[PDB]
Amino acid sequence: MEEINTRLTFTVRRCAPELIVPAEPTPRELKPLSDIDDQEILRCHQKAIQFFRADPKMRHKNPASVIREALAKLLVFYYPFAGRIKESPVGKLMVDCTGEGVLFIEAEADVTLSQFGDPLQPPFPCIDELLYDVPGSSAILDAPIILYQVTRLSCGGFILAVRYNHAMTDAAGLLQFMSALGEIAGGATSPSIMPVWKRELLCSSETTQKSFFLTTTEISAFRRYVPTHLQSCTTFELLTACIWRCHTIALQPDPEEEMNMIWPVNVRNKFKFDPPLPAGYYGNLLAFSVAMSSARDLCSKPLGYALELVMKANHDVTKKKIGSVSDLLKPIKGPLPVRHDIVSDLIHGHYSMEFGWGKATYTGPATNNPGLTTYYVPYTNNKGESGVVVPLLLRSAVMTRFVNEINNMLAQVQNN
């Protein structure tokens, strides 16, 4: 299992972080976050990144300035994003729309866009410096909800890095928002999709980083040595059953502890909501599927055991298809288990954002839970092999036991 390493490094320097408030008076109100947005597994942040190449006609236009003026203008419509999230009695989250503003960082880097590769894919170097974690902002409550870093590159290109409070929006909502930002920086009067709230509809009253590469041939090879009755499995399912079982064998937990593997599902493509969703909704619309087993059964039984659990969990959430949003979209049931890993499927453009410099040359993820939290990215190496890159952050011993265990599985798949 190949480790991918970024041998590139460079020096970043950033101004001191600033607060961007909406450019015009906006409603000062308390807006309810939905039962989907405020579940435990979403009380985290997430990181996205886009790379933009130089545009010769955009000379005399510093990208940080363009973006921060457009942020101010766009926050008039998305004004809750300038708010602060607070907790009421019985655990309901609210956005206090105070206009205190989103965090912003203008920076420069002694590096060129082309030095990130061609094609440019993860891992990305110096990402902790390209999306600086300002102290106290890692908080869910009373902290700025979103953070931008615009790093200018020596070629005149630039980097747009975002950290956002996952209680506020999901990847899809942030995409609607970033496309509204692109439109406003394009000169638009207002967004094409006028956002709405309506989240009441979903209210019911020692460590180590690393990135590893598995080629498609290795994945499909796996698919050959699982029982025929499980061969309809997705690449995602097979990869997730591998990761879950290998990680558990690496953790070596108490035999009876309940091991959970959890992943989100975008439902927009899937269900047909009978009261359909509002046109500009941008809260969370993720379903979550949960696969659970004793540590002893995961480590004791072959990969087919884990794989069946993953595939069947992947249809618990897909099986009821028409009705209300409150009917088909539920939070995870209880408090999160002690033992839970989180995987996300990213093998899927994120196109049509244009800020004057074109559409991004790359848009994707970047870089709490003490389990394993990772995502799958597409990757093609220098010889042409397409496959998946899995960024892992584990205690070093757990990492090498994990790597060795998936390498044992590769050894088995090839011996057979």
Side-chain angles (χ1 to χ4, degrees), residues 1 3-6 8-45 47-332 334-416:
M1 178 174 57
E3 184 177 342
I4 309 284
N5 277 298
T6 189
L8 177 65
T9 184
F10 48 91
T11 43
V12 185
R13 50 203 144 79
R14 53 199 140 62
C15 310
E18 48 200 292
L19 269 313
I20 314 285
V21 306
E24 164 187 327
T26 61
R28 207 224 162 107
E29 45 178 7
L30 206 64
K31 302 214 91 149
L33 290 168
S34 89
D35 307 330
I36 304 290
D37 327 318
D38 60 19
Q39 51 182 322
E40 205 196 316
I41 206 192
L42 296 183
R43 316 277 251 257
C44 68
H45 301 83
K47 298 187 193 200
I49 198 163
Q50 344 191 247
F51 292 80
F52 288 89
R53 64 214 180 286
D55 198 72
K57 203 67 190 289
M58 245 39 58
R59 201 224 218 185
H60 291 111
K61 283 314 189 125
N62 149 267
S65 312
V66 188
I67 279 135
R68 98 160 56 78
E69 305 306 323
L71 265 174
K73 291 172 102 302
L74 196 261
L75 283 169
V76 173
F77 303 99
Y78 281 93
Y79 62 87
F81 259 120
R84 293 289 180 284
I85 292 163
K86 312 229 177 92
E87 207 164 30
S88 74
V90 276
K92 194 104 206 84
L93 286 187
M94 302 293 207
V95 194
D96 194 5
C97 303
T98 67
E100 266 154 294
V102 314
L103 259 175
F104 192 83
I105 298 191
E106 175 193 310
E108 296 179 347
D110 310 341
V111 67
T112 203
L113 173 51
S114 65
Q115 274 174 278
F116 291 84
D118 195 316
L120 88 164
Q121 347 171 72
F124 305 115
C126 312
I127 192 115
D128 283 325
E129 295 267 297
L130 286 173
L131 182 53
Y132 181 65
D133 166 33
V134 185
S137 46
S138 26
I140 309 303
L141 309 149
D142 275 308
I145 285 172
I146 161 151
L147 192 156
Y148 306 85
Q149 183 168 325
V150 184
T151 314
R152 306 186 58 163
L153 299 185
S154 311
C155 57
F158 66 93
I159 300 172
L160 170 43
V162 166
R163 187 218 312 149
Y164 62 98
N165 186 309
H166 197 342
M168 173 58 105
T169 204
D170 58 30
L174 180 76
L175 179 44
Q176 174 184 295
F177 172 97
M178 290 297 168
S179 148
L181 195 66
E183 282 168 345
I184 291 299
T189 155
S190 50
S192 332
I193 295 107
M194 285 291 272
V196 321
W197 198 244
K198 290 320 164 47
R199 313 227 179 158
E200 319 93 35
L201 294 200
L202 273 318
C203 295
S204 189
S205 324
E206 313 198 309
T207 206
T208 306
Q209 221 297 302
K210 258 155 208 304
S211 294
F212 296 85
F213 180 56
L214 286 308
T215 64
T216 283
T217 159
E218 291 152 17
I219 308 302
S220 59
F222 283 151
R223 178 178 282 99
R224 285 313 108 189
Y225 296 94
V226 89
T228 36
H229 82 282
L230 301 176
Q231 265 168 1
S232 59
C233 51
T234 312
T235 293
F236 168 94
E237 290 169 341
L238 195 58
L239 249 188
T240 302
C242 289
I243 284 169
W244 191 32
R245 189 201 196 272
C246 283
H247 184 228
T248 304
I249 293 179
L251 264 196
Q252 296 284 297
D254 274 334
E256 272 93 59
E257 305 189 45
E258 289 188 343
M259 308 298 146
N260 289 261
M261 180 55 97
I262 301 177
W263 60 91
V265 186
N266 203 337
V267 294
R268 302 177 165 74
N269 278 340
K270 305 293 202 306
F271 309 157
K272 228 205 266 196
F273 307 86
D274 197 348
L277 268 313
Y281 198 78
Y282 62 106
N284 281 282
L285 292 173
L286 309 164
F288 287 83
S289 71
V290 184
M292 188 273 260
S293 175
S294 70
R296 57 169 44 258
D297 296 347
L298 258 179
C299 307
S300 254
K301 304 162 166 307
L303 174 69
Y305 171 77
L307 178 51
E308 180 156 9
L309 292 181
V310 170
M311 303 170 69
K312 288 182 157 53
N314 215 5
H315 294 51
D316 277 54
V317 299
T318 317
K319 56 73 48 191
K320 175 86 148 52
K321 102 214 57 185
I322 192 129
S324 347
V325 208
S326 33
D327 275 80
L328 306 191
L329 237 207
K330 324 163 93 146
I332 293 184
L336 280 191
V338 188
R339 230 77 176 193
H340 64 275
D341 294 331
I342 300 158
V343 169
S344 203
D345 201 355
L346 259 308
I347 337 198
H348 181 258
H350 299 139
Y351 70 112
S352 169
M353 286 135 319
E354 211 274 7
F355 302 82
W357 284 255
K359 37 186 172 137
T361 168
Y362 175 96
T363 308
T367 213
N368 167 272
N369 159 48
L372 167 146
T373 300
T374 183
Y375 44 97
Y376 306 153
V377 293
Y379 188 91
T380 312
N381 65 359
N382 36 290
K383 292 160 295 319
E385 315 161 286
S386 307
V388 181
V389 153
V390 299
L392 276 192
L393 179 84
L394 301 167
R395 264 222 314 296
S396 323
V398 176
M399 175 82 78
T400 116
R401 282 169 66 74
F402 177 86
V403 175
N404 296 346
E405 184 51 51
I406 93 98
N407 279 320
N408 293 336
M409 286 188 59
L410 302 184
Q412 259 156 353
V413 89
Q414 279 265 2
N415 265 340
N416 300 8

